[PDB]
Design a protein around this nucleic acid. Structure first.
Length: 48
DNA sequence: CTATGGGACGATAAAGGTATAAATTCTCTATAATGGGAGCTGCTCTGGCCGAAGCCCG
């Protein structure tokens, strides 16, 4: 599950709100599986 | 008796003619047609720039 693409946040609009995990991510989006680098937290993976 | 300038020579390349096919641009067609559309929206700050609105003020 990515956040980039059409109608999505660009890496220059990162900030912190999208790139942080929230209690609402529990069991929906994996908290620890994200690519390290320019796009961190923007690209995540669904939970099991 | 010999080397060198002088002049004769001539085979051909350029110059002009001179048409000639290619080729490459130019001009037309007449029912009616009479304001476009993708444009992002989730930076962040700093910095400068005009322009308006209070703020002294004599």
């Amino acid at each position: 599950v990515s956040a980039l693409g059409p109608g999505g946040l660009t890496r220059e609009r990162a900030g912190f709100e999208v790139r942080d995990v929230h209690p609402t991510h529990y069991g929906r989006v994996c908290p620890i599986e994200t690519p390290e680098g320019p796009n961190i937290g923007l690209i995540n993976s669904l939970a099991t």
